[PDB]
Structures are given as C-alpha cells and as structure tokens.
Enzyme design. Structure first.
Site, short mmCIF file in Angstrom:
data_model
loop_
_atom_site.label_atom_id
_atom_site.label_comp_id
_atom_site.label_asym_id
_atom_site.label_seq_id
_atom_site.Cartn_x
_atom_site.Cartn_y
_atom_site.Cartn_z
N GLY A 158 48.06 46.49 -10.66
CA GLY A 158 48.20 46.67 -9.22
C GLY A 158 47.95 48.10 -8.78
O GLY A 158 47.95 49.02 -9.60
N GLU A 159 47.69 48.26 -7.46
CA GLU A 159 47.45 49.52 -6.74
C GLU A 159 48.25 49.45 -5.44
O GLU A 159 48.28 48.38 -4.81
CB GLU A 159 45.96 49.70 -6.44
N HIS B 240 51.17 52.25 -2.83
CA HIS B 240 51.51 53.47 -2.09
C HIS B 240 51.32 54.75 -2.92
O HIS B 240 52.28 55.27 -3.51
CB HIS B 240 52.93 53.35 -1.51
N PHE B 241 50.06 55.26 -2.97
CA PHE B 241 49.62 56.46 -3.71
C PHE B 241 49.80 56.34 -5.26
O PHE B 241 49.69 57.34 -5.97
CB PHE B 241 50.27 57.74 -3.14
N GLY B 242 50.02 55.11 -5.75
CA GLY B 242 50.19 54.81 -7.16
C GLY B 242 49.36 53.66 -7.69
O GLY B 242 48.74 52.91 -6.93
N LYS B 243 49.31 53.54 -9.03
CA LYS B 243 48.61 52.48 -9.75
C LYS B 243 49.46 52.02 -10.93
O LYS B 243 50.15 52.83 -11.54
CB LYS B 243 47.20 52.90 -10.20
N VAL B 244 49.43 50.73 -11.22
CA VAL B 244 50.14 50.16 -12.36
C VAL B 244 49.09 49.59 -13.30
O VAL B 244 48.17 48.90 -12.87
CB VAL B 244 51.25 49.14 -12.00
N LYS C 149 53.17 52.87 -14.52
CA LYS C 149 52.95 53.32 -13.16
C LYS C 149 52.69 54.85 -13.13
O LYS C 149 53.48 55.65 -13.65
CB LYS C 149 54.12 52.92 -12.25
N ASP D 196 60.46 46.55 0.67
CA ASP D 196 59.19 45.91 0.35
C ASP D 196 59.40 44.55 -0.31
O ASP D 196 58.59 44.11 -1.15
CB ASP D 196 58.27 46.85 -0.47
C1 LIG Z 1 47.33 37.72 -13.05
O1 LIG Z 1 47.63 38.92 -12.34
C2 LIG Z 1 48.69 39.67 -12.76
C3 LIG Z 1 49.39 39.47 -13.94
C4 LIG Z 1 50.44 40.30 -14.24
F1 LIG Z 1 51.10 40.10 -15.39
C5 LIG Z 1 50.85 41.33 -13.41
C6 LIG Z 1 51.99 42.21 -13.73
N1 LIG Z 1 52.33 43.21 -12.92
C7 LIG Z 1 53.42 43.80 -13.54
C8 LIG Z 1 54.23 44.89 -13.18
N2 LIG Z 1 53.99 45.64 -12.01
C9 LIG Z 1 52.89 45.35 -11.10
C10 LIG Z 1 53.18 45.18 -9.62
C11 LIG Z 1 52.13 44.18 -9.12
C12 LIG Z 1 52.37 43.86 -7.66
N3 LIG Z 1 53.76 43.43 -7.38
C13 LIG Z 1 54.77 44.33 -7.98
C14 LIG Z 1 54.57 44.59 -9.44
C15 LIG Z 1 55.27 45.22 -14.05
CL1 LIG Z 1 56.32 46.55 -13.65
C16 LIG Z 1 55.48 44.50 -15.21
N4 LIG Z 1 54.71 43.46 -15.57
C17 LIG Z 1 53.71 43.15 -14.72
N5 LIG Z 1 52.78 42.14 -14.84
C18 LIG Z 1 50.14 41.53 -12.23
C19 LIG Z 1 49.07 40.71 -11.89
O2 LIG Z 1 48.33 40.83 -10.75
C20 LIG Z 1 49.00 41.28 -9.56
#
Ligand SMILES: COc1cc(F)c(-c2nc3c(NCC4CCNCC4)c(Cl)cnc3[nH]2)cc1OC
Length: 281
Positions: A18-19, A21-25, A44, A130
């Site tokens: 994900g992308e 508020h000024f961050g990326k995961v 993140k 949020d």
């Molecule tokens: C199939 O598409 C995805 C699969 C996934 F497994 C994940 C995922 N995102 C996180 C995540 N953070 C990300 C943010 C995203 C948007 N909402 C708040 C969480 C964290 Cl901390 C821990 N495991 C995660 N797994 C995201 C995906 O697409 C949005």
C-alpha cells in the site's frame, strides 16, 4: 540482543502492499541467514514527515490487542516500522473473493472484532480517524485486525476531542459532521466511521455500492471543491446510506445509531458489541 531491532542489510523487499499519507508499506523478508527461510514482515517507510511516522510507531508499539495488527520492531536519522504480515490483505481485497465463505453470521463476528479493537483504542484515549474496510486486515476467515494507524491521534485528558490542522486528504465520505464542519474528532466520530465500515462489510466492499459512489449519487459527482459542503448539507437534512441488500433491519438499526447527527446521541462501541452478540446467540 534486541528482538525489535531489524538490521537493514537483512530486510529484503518482496513487493508493495500500500501507499498513503506520505508513506509506503512493502512486503519484505527479514532473512539474517540469507536462504529465503526468514519471516515475512510488512514494512512502513516514508516516500518532512518523519515526526508522524515516529508518533505512529510509538502508538502501535504500546497497543496489545488481538484485533490490532502487531508491531514487531523498527529499522533505523531515518526509520522504518516493522509489522506482522497478513497475506489475505484487507476487507476490500478479501470480501469480493470470499462471498460464499463469509455469510451474515461471520460478517457480524467481524463487526464485533472491529468494535473490540476500537473500544480498546478509545480506552487508551486515541481517535483512529481512518476507520474504513480498506484498513481492516484479515488474519483468517475467523479473525480481522485494525491496521493503518497513520492518522491516529491522542485526545488530551479531561478533553472530548482532537482538533485537526492538516485535512487536505480527509476520507470525507467516512467522516462525521463535526469532522467535516469544525475539524473536531471525538471517540463518537470513530463510531460514525464504524457505521460506514459496517455498510461496506455488508456489501462485501463492492465498488459500485461504496459510501463514496453512493454519496456522489445522492449529492452529484461534478461539484469539485463544493462536494464537502453539499455532503454536509445532505447529512443535515437527515439523509443516510441506504440499507445494504440482504441486510436485516435489526442490523440496519444498529448502523443508523452510528449516524446520529449529534456526537453525544450516537451509540458506543460497547452498545454495538452487546447489540451484535444478541443477534449472534
Ligand atoms: C492482495 O492485496 C493485498 C494483500 C495483502 F496481504 C496486503 C497487506 N497489507 C498489509 C499491511 N499493511 C498495508 C495497509 C494496506 C491498506 N490498508 C491498511 C494496511 C500490514 Cl501492516 C500487514 N500485512 C499486510 N498485508 C495488502 C494488499 O493490498 C492492499
């Protein structure tokens, strides 16, 4: 020996998650042995906003609840937040692909879990700001967790709300009228957002039934800078999102108590848990 300290040289990037508020995961593998047997973690980092990332790390490090995504550590004047990885993603990805598996009973069990995590946050005197289905992570078919504490703020002791300054990227269609009109955030404002998150969950996060898509049908999609004021006007008139298809009226009534114009007239998280549990057993 610090189990919460992750060395940069061992953190191998897999892909973007994900992308915001000024961050990326990103999905990474922490591989100190270099053989791809290491643990996968959500990382993140920033795309100056280091101060917000550091406050978010401090908030999440001191949160311990089964319905809250787990903090794992940090990677260090730059810093990275290391969290547990949930491969199912959020309700937005999960729900459209698992309609057959996720029946009404299971949706109510997820709503209770979301309320428990939120009530725990509120007891620590935090406002999430949020709460949406896109921010609710799926651990399994039986469990969900609140993720993304990027907008999370502390309400001062002997105060009922937090005043917001930077609001340019506000998820307006999930926001209570006091948030849209005065930029005031109460625990009750999170209750409003929960009602909207419940609506998404009952519609299995279908894009054509989304709070934004539905609200833009009600107010018009071509008003630009006048959207928020037209939205505020509609809510003031008493208009709310309609009952989701196949949603029983008793579940709809619980949802509508989240949407009382006045914050003090809104239901609490504890009343919602009681309400959903009475429907479950
Ligand atoms: C199939 O598409 C995805 C699969 C996934 F497994 C994940 C995922 N995102 C996180 C995540 N953070 C990300 C943010 C995203 C948007 N909402 C708040 C969480 C964290 Cl901390 C821990 N495991 C995660 N797994 C995201 C995906 O697409 C949005």
């Amino acid at each position: 020996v610090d189990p919460t300290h992750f060395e940069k040289r061992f953190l191998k990037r897999i892909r973007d998650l994900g992308e915001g508020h000024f961050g990326k995961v990103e999905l990474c593998r922490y591989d100190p042995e270099g053989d791809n047997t290491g643990e996968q973690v959500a990382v993140k980092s920033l795309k100056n906003h280091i101060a917000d990332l550091k406050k978010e790390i401090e908030i999440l490090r001191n949160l311990y609840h089964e319905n809250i995504v787990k903090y794992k550590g940090i990677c260090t004047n730059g810093i990275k937040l290391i969290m547990e990885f949930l491969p199912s993603g959020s309700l937005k990805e999960y729900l459209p692909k698992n309609k057959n598996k996720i029946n009404l009973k299971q949706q109510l069990k997820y709503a209770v879990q979301i309320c428990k995590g939120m009530d725990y946050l509120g007891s620590r005197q935090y406002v999430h700001r949020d709460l949406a289905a896109r921010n609710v992570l799926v651990e399994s078919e039986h469990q969900v967790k609140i993720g993304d504490f990027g907008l999370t703020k502390a309400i001062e002791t002997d105060k009922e709300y937090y005043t917001v300054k930077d609001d340019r990227d506000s998820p307006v269609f999930w926001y209570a009228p006091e948030c849209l009109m005065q930029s005031k955030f109460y625990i009750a404002s999170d209750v409003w957002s929960f009602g909207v998150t419940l609506h998404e969950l009952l519609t299995y996060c279908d894009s054509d039934s989304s709070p934004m898509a539905l609200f833009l049908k009600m107010i018009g999609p071509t008003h630009g800078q006048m959207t928020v004021t037209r939205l505020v006007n509609t809510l003031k008139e008493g208009k709310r999102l309609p009952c989701p298809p196949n949603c029983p009226d008793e579940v709809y009534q619980l949802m509508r108590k989240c949407w009382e114009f006045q914050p003090s007239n809104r239901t609490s998280f504890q009343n919602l848990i009681e309400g959903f549990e009475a429907l479950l057993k």
